[PDB]
Amino acid sequence: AVKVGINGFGRIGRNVFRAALKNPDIEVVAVNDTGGANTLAHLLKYDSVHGRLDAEVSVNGNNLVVNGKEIIVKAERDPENLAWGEIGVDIVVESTGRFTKREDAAKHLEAGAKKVIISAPAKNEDITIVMGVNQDKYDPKAHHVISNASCTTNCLAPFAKVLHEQFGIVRGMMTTVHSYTNDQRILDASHKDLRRARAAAESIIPTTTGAAKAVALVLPELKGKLNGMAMRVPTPNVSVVDLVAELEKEVTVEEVNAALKAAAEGELKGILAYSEEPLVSRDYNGSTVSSTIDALSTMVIDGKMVKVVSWYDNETGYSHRVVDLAAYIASKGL
Amino acid sequence: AVKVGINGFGRIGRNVFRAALKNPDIEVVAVNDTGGANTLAHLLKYDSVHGRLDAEVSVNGNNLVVNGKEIIVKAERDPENLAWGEIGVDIVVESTGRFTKREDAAKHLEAGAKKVIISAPAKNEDITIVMGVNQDKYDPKAHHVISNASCTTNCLAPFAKVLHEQFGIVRGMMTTVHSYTNDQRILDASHKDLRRARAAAESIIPTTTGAAKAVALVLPELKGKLNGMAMRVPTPNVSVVDLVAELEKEVTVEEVNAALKAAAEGELKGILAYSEEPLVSRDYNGSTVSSTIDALSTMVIDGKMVKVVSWYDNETGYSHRVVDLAAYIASKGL
Amino acid sequence: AVKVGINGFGRIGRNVFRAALKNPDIEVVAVNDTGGANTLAHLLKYDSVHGRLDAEVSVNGNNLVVNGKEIIVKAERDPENLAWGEIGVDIVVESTGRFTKREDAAKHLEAGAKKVIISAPAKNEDITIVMGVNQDKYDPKAHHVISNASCTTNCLAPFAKVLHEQFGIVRGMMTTVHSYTNDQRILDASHKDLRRARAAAESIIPTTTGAAKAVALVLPELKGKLNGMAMRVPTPNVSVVDLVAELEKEVTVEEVNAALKAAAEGELKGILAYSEEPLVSRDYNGSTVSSTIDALSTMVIDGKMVKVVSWYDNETGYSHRVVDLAAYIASKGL
Amino acid sequence: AVKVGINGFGRIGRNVFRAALKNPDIEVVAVNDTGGANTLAHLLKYDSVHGRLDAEVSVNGNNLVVNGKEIIVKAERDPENLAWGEIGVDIVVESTGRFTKREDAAKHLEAGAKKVIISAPAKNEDITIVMGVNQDKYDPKAHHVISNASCTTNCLAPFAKVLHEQFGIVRGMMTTVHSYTNDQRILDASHKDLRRARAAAESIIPTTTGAAKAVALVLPELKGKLNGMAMRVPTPNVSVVDLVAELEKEVTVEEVNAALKAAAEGELKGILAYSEEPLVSRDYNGSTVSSTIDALSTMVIDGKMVKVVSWYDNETGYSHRVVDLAAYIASKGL
Numbered sequence A, B, C, D: 001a002v003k004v005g006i007n008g009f010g011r012i013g014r015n016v017f018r019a020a021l022k023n024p025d026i027e028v029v030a031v032n033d034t035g036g037a038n039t040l041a042h043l044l045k046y047d048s049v050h051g052r053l054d055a056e057v058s059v060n061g062n063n064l065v066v067n068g069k070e071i072i073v074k075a076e077r078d079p080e081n082l083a084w085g086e087i088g089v090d091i092v093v094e095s096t097g098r099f100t101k102r103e104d105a106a107k108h109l110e111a112g113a114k115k116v117i118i119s120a121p122a123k124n125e126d127i128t129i130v131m132g133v134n135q136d137k138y139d140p141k142a143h144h145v146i147s148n149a150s151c152t153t154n155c156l157a158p159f160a161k162v163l164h165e166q167f168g169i170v171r172g173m174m175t176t177v178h179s180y181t182n183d184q185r186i187l188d189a190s191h192k193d194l195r196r197a198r199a200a201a202e203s204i205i206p207t208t209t210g211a212a213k214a215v216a217l218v219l220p221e222l223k224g225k226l227n228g229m230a231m232r233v234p235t236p237n238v239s240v241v242d243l244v245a246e247l248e249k250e251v252t253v254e255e256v257n258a259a260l261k262a263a264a265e266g267e268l269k270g271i272l273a274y275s276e277e278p279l280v281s282r283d284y285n286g287s288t289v290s291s292t293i294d295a296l297s298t299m300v301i302d303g304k305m306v307k308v309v310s311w312y313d314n315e316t317g318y319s320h321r322v323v324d325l326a327a328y329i330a331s332k333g334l
Ligand SMILES: NC(=O)C1=CN([C@@H]2O[C@H](COP(=O)(O)OP(=O)(O)OC[C@H]3O[C@@H](n4cnc5c(N)ncnc54)[C@H](OP(=O)(O)O)[C@@H]3O)[C@@H](O)[C@H]2O)C=CC1
Pocket: A007, A008, A009, A010, A011, A012, A013, A032, A033, A034, A035, A076, A077, A078, A095, A096, A097, A098, A119, A120, A149, A150, A151, A181, A182, A314, A315, A318, D189, D190
């Protein structure tokens, strides 16, 4: 029903496409990227991390043909020239990573789209939404340039919410042991971050993250109470958040796990999950949820300090949330 | 001067051997391992993580010959038949990973040695020492079977001591993002630990660690105040400790780093180092200290919760501490 | 239909089980391994390379339950005590890697089995079969202990057959760039083979292979004509054969390629596959065929020397051939 | 003595700098790159593959200071604006990877340099040289735009020569199992080569190479007799050439290796090396020669077809040859 257009057919752009495939509410009608149709068709079909796409993919001229439907392919470096209006694209997924500033993303609205979903933290956006945490604050009349936050914020917020409501967070530190991404280097080379300039697959690479702070965007009561960092490691996909927090209430591992398990089966079902199996990162490659609690890792010291570990497929979970967001927006009245 | 014998010529045994070459006080005279002299010579000469041994290594009979010195090579699976006393071996480094209980390690003293140093946490040891933290509690009469603790406790204890003495630690939790060891599997295979049963170079593997509890063995004032877990990752060597602690005094990042820098330059010189460079794990490969503070990572929320990150070459740093301990015991009288 | 028992639930045993799931003719009813049921079930369900087993798996007592069926789990290191017959096991899949000598594998026959299939090269086996090559020489009276050869031989044989019948192989060399296996080491440690004693995920490790010579067992005409080596690399699965050969006839890439494609859709369908896509190893992870010609790599020099490259998932292609052999044998008579 | 300028301070540029340090005849006086002095200084001091630079390095304003010597750092994207003459640079090392066509490479000559060395196969260059093979064909009044060929060609050529002179190469095929380079992608991304568009550390990626045919540039006699391909694998540095050749003479493995060993100690000493140790890739990391025969791998079928395997540090051995070429050209008169 809702016609979607994707700007930047990269790791997130292609996985949003895959995610959209199984959703009948949304419909991707066009993609824009710097690469050509044939190169794009090849990368959509064969994925080193998620396997082959089970859908027939072809190229008809300058367009992709997926399961008989023609997807238009544009090669506009400048968003302003996209003409989303002519093709009837309602919602645009901004996933180039170049246009997270409102002044850039809005160029899509001026080009013909009705809503823009920036797939990353943004600046001067109308609203940052984390599904399961605050999609209710979205106003169809007021918000048009929306941010879906980072994969890490989507992983942390859902459970920081439950921890906050049930016991109360005084302050907390977090660390995400995260898989490497296309922002890193294969072998030592210039990068604006001297840590990310180092061979990605060869080391544990500490780097900064704003995901901790961003939680305040969706959970205002936590402003100034959380901070953290990231450690990029030699894995191609899937990451894990490690949150150590000072609680207001005295608690037990049993109480904490039970609270998390409850949310995962109730209110946050589909966003937050709960596991008691001794699994590893590879086991989570492909999970569509935003945050899966690794229940076995939960610990408490002095009844007030806690450690909660949650898994997340940074490409898949996130891409599913983008599609869910799109579908939610469409339903609230486009 | 003091003759040493190494039991278990593996990753730690060979690196202890490499460390001893640069120490005039200790003298390695014999090694015991299940492998044959030729295999052991090859593995000592060429190392995938540390490169070529800068010394002449050859085989004479079924004995090793290093830089002209003949090293007796034994092959007794039962420590009771090593006859250390006959060849004048006073100190034995127990690094097979199988004789960590005082009862077993003690078989070396029966074979004639005067002291045994277990290169790992032990059960029932006379004392557990972390050089720079509690070596002064070593008693020549009462302590024969000593544990050098884990590579992780050796990294944590030195700065936890500083944080404690300077600001007071109320409680803290740690996570070590650690390189894989010979205790894991290349491909999925039977293992006591179902996390460690999974392909080491393919996932982030949360695993348990007693390393945070063990700090209380060397710093009793911290008994019951710390806890933590581990995460094994696809790197062959070098690990990092991530410590989050609730302090008593309100501090700033500058105060925390200044204290750390001062100790690295003072009392803990040689054991605790300090760095303000944006480096990655591969850069600490070969580091001989026990803990190198990543100053650029220090963080603080609410003036009371601090985050400190420290690097450690789990093989080289620990192996150097073993040699330092052997040298310190010898100087106390054997 | 035909009852099968698996000896050694390792990578090949668990993948033979998985492949067994979609074949109506055979039925796995018992497994024997060094590990416990809970461990065996965990590793059967979660696989770091192939993913979650899409089947309900659980432990009932000392037994496994997989989609309602209860699989008998035993722990006998001595195959003579397995009592295959009491439980009706017709065919035994010997995949421990320890009993490759006929005298050893024959213990299962002493135990009540009727046929044994060694999942690797053997010594004094009654016959070595490569499905699609010489399975027609199996004689239910004459052969009881059969070898399914190596993953490499199953990859090389099918296309070396075609090439030989078509143009005449005068002589040729092969090199298999193979993923690492459980036979290698994570970090430097003792090994019969000093190349394989080195950290598996850190290097390109040259090693021997009898795969080229073993082709003579299934194709006598090629006796004394082929030879080769292996190079183990940092991937956990999927390998490729690189064959360079001198033909008797003068050929063109087109001809060589047409010959191979023709066979893939003809006689060798399901065993030999043909590809004109520019794919990479991870794309073949999960392929059930034995050999997939990488058509774009075929080269010819002087119209007489050819180069052919074929991919193979060493775990899946092989485990499927094992299941096929079991099914073929049974159809021939037990 | 001779003043050198490096255009493109990447993997090859920094390693050419390092090698240059060890040569008294050459003096690197300037570097041109897209990154700033601080970034460049950091990347030169810390290498993920080669370790810390054994030198005193600092940034004096906008220049590098290495052991007292100041290195002018420029940020020109267009070589025409480089002004090499202004600073006295006689030889320019073109290592950006973007100016291999004579039209671009010569812009250096126009900007004032006297000679240009292209660190890769070139187009319309005056001469392609492989040290130890045809450096003597260098004509100082004619040859101003020189290509040092590729790392692969530098590995193959030296031994292709010896085999030819001694037994006569009728024809041969080569495969290079090569480490990934900065030309590949960390994760699936657009690339003109759909093979190299795939996650570099996750697969065995077959790709093309012109290194076999390029041997004809330096050993004209072998024009039309060789061809081959490459396989990029998940290792950061060090590669191996696998050559299968049809010889004119009847040979034995001993005959083959004896020829190679002699050459390594004779004419090609310093370029070609010989090894009878069972080593692996990491062992060759840091090797300065261009090719090292893995003697244990030499194989022969029918006394006419040989297989020779040679290791090569693609970054170090090559950079040394670049510096050797610069020192040689200069000796002839600039
Ligand atoms: N990967 C992950 O785990 C997650 C990433 N994100 C965010 O998603 C965004 C994309 O990241 P990711 O998909 O990983 O990165 P990629 O590099 O894989 O993808 C970005 C795609 O956009 C293309 N592109 C760049 N500029 C243009 C342009 N001007 N017009 C059209 N297309 C263009 C790129 O091509 P090219 O660069 O080759 O020119 C590339 O194909 C980033 O902002 C990232 O922070 C959010 C959650 C998770």
